[PDB]
Amino acid sequence: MPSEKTFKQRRTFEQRVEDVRLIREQHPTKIPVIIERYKGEKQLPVLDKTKFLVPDHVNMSELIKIIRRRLQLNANQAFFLLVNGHSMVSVSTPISEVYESEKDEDGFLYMVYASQETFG
């Protein structure tokens, strides 16, 4: 997915429900999360991670750190993870608690990411 075009070109909603079913069966200690760049301002690079499988005991601040580094964003470059469309950039919480709080209709969690929370 990181070398191809935008995530929907790889996998659709019902096929992401199949991903949740397979991952919950094989590795239930990891949490199913989707990640996508903000459509209103595509300022950040096309380093399309698309999804991640986070261990239960990883902090949201630690997830932010690995994802900021994988997106090549140095300390001077602005960056935010928007859980279900809203920022949690300052929070220390374990990913499972953030998950059960913001888990969507079919068992996945969403994170939109951006250089600023809104622009247009």
């Binding site: 997915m1 991640f52 261990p55 990883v58 690995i66």
Partner: peptide, 17 residues
């Protein structure tokens, strides 16, 4: 490495502790 694609994948591309 594997990161984001299919099935048996290590999508966070790290060994947890």
């Amino acid at each position: 490495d594997y990161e984001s694609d299919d099935d048996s994948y290590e999508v966070l591309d790290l060994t947890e502790y």
